[PDB]
DNA sequence: GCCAACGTTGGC
DNA sequence: GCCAACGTTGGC
């Protein structure tokens, strides 16, 4: 079996040191060959997840901080974890003085866009199924999503990520 | 290396 | 805009 993943993106606009953090899928289906690398990751535990991942592993992108939050779409690696260049410029967002460039703190990954949802599976959905499974034991009993809530980038099982895949297909 | 004092994520 | 959950920093 493979891994599967979830990152977070935030769809609608918000200034980080005077810059837009702004990315919806939306936005990376705009992009040339609908591809982009995920910059900007400056979590320990998370950028290890990143570079757990492998060539054509797929995640769920997140929508995060916005009016409806939760899964809009797929995507897949397309390159593995490799520095994050974003770090060493002097006005970036996410600059980090405290990195030196013989061996560099933070990763990115390059992802390309797979598909949207059927339809979108708002973070709501997800959290009613998370606290019924604990009760009844089914696929998002342990969903990373709600047991480490401060995390942007997240291992999911065979079993949370073929579930997701099954709300797609009934009814809201 | 502990742990008060911050700093950040992200739902609501 | 509020603030809980979770992370980082630095005096001791």
Known sequence: LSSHWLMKSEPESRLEKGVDVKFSIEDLKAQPKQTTCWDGVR??????FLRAMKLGEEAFFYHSNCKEPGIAGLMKIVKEAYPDH???EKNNPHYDPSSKEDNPK???????FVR??????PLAELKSYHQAHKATGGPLKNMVLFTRQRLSIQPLTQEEFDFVLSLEEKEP
């Open 43 to 48: 979590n320990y535990q998370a950028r290890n």
């Open 86 to 88: 974003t770090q060493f």
């Open 106 to 112: 933070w990763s990115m990954v390059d992802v390309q």
């Open 116 to 121: 949207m949802m059927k339809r979108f599976i």
